[PDB]
């Protein structure tokens with residue numbers, strides 16, 4: 001099969017002109033479009049003849065879709081069908097960032113609790129079924145490529161840039177879950193891309209040249225960052241997406257910035273040493289290498305979008321993502337100029353022509369392997385739409401989402417059997433969180449439990465604390481409550497701490513993200529109120545609540561708006577609090593102590609049984 005796949009791809013590439021070949025290596029977006037006569041772009045939700053004409057002219061290898069383009073199942077199937085009608089010779093790779101959790105694009109699909117939640121749920125089977133469900137939805141929609149999984153390792157709490165998009169701080173847990181997410185997508189014939197190579201998880205905090213910098217030496221990079229990429233590559237990864245990050249330990253090449261004329265270190269995307277020497281040769285990856293988005297401001301500014309395409313191709317990449325930003329026919333020639341720059345590089349010998357042929361063969365082999373080519377589907381658009389409506393966001397998928405999110409909830413403290421809350425009729429629950437959307441999600445979850453007669457009728461009060469200070473009016477609310485649920489949101493956990501003592505005296509609204517919830521905790525404890533803290537994003541804030549009797553993490557923070565839950569994590573937490581779910585989560589990261597700096601407060605793998613109060 002793979003043998004036959006390669007001969008086939010070779011015959012196809014041998015017949016293509018250079019224009020057709022360079023076309024395959026481009027993957028633009030058409031997020032917004034401004035038609036002739038229009039004064040401004042608007043979201044592209046349906047095909048028009050202007051966009052179709054550029055797809056026909058330049059013969060792109062693919063299109064990346066964004067949320068603007070995929071708002072409903074009906075519109076999306078119509079759009080992917082019309083994109084493919086405009087690309088009949090070689091079907092397009094139609095791609096998307098459908099990661100789950102905090103990065104999703106589908107307007108009507110299943111969101112999932114995200115990677116760190118999968119880390120917390122631990123099982124490779126859960127990651128596989130998640131990738132499998134995402135893959136089923138994408139496939140029904142006519143989307144055939146997913147830029148997932150993230151296999152970046154979030155191992156530095158002091159710079160958690162990938163954060164909940166990462167499975168874990170541990171290389172093996174990240175590797176395992178990445179591998180099975182990828183197998184799950186591929187099982188549904190979705191091309192999967194590992195990202196972001198060679199590892200975006202731990203960049204230098206004081207990066208100050210616009211491109212993130214990783215200062216670690218090769219031994220550490222080979223032992224940690226590269227490890228889940230290697231495992232997945234050997235298990236048959238289709239694609240790898242680059243990181244626009246400097247790695248001096250592998251390439252110290254500089255270029256003269258077009259932004260300020262200074263010498264700038266090359267990012268991994270434009271490094272032959274990383275793309276060819278390390279990924280292609282040393283790690284033996286022969287699948288498709290795709291750049292991270294070339295419109296990222298620092299690439300465009302330091303290198304120029306057009307010249308970056310040429311440099312990335314020279315470095316050994318196969319697909320340039322978003323190689324030019326074209327939003328109307330007035331700027332179509334941006335595409336012609338990109339092609340022309342690649343032609344000049346081939347003509348003058350900067351890029352050997354055989355390198356181009358080899359890259360397009362990788363692309364065509366992948367399209368064949370994942371059943372993108374040849375296309376022999378005889379269903380009408382209407383028929384595909386009806387099929388997709390049964391699959392996308394189906395209640396079966398939503399049930400899986402719910403059970404995964406509930407499974408991932410991690411109980412860090414439950415002293416004195418504080419949880420579950422079992423309120424008597426007439427209890428007042430005070431619900432406190434940074435935003436109205438978050439308090440609404442908690443409120444709506446409790447309301448549903450009441451209508452479902454799972455808990456007795458209770459009164460609810462909400463307290464939204466972003467930018468606020470806890471004062472006498474808030475303490476009054478705490479005193480009047482019978483149960484308190486508080487949500488905490490941090491990226492980096494940054495309380496003011498002195499010699500291991502957290503500062504509670506900050507009374508002017510500054511530092512609210514840590515000061516306010518702690519103040520609610522202190523009042524509740526002072527007034528003997530059942531109090532639970534729910535960590536909403538990065539779980540490092542658990543370290544701020546050692547005095548609390550009940551503490552959980554849900555690893556996702558988006559709330560409820562326009563009758564819709566934006567993420568399932570918060571409802572999963574509330575369900576656990578009221579004894580209607582079985583949390584089984586264990587930490588996928590270490591949580592550093594703030595009161596004893598340098599010590600781990602809660603280690604990787606820690607999590608309690610909510611019933612027995614004992615560790616899992």
Ligand SMILES: CC(=O)N[C@@H]1[C@@H](O[C@H](C)C(=O)O)[C@H](O[C@@H]2O[C@H](CO)[C@@H](O)[C@H](O)[C@H]2NC(C)=O)[C@@H](CO)O[C@@H]1O
Pocket residue numbers: 097103147195196200244292293295296297
């Ligand atoms: C709001 C927005 O779109 N910002 C983008 C970046 O995307 C963010 C990070 C996002 O939506 O997740 C964009 O980042 C890259 O975009 C690629 C394609 O959408 C992603 O596949 C990729 O994962 C993402 N890179 C990272 C490290 O997250 C960025 C270019 O890097 O340009 C805008 O800022």
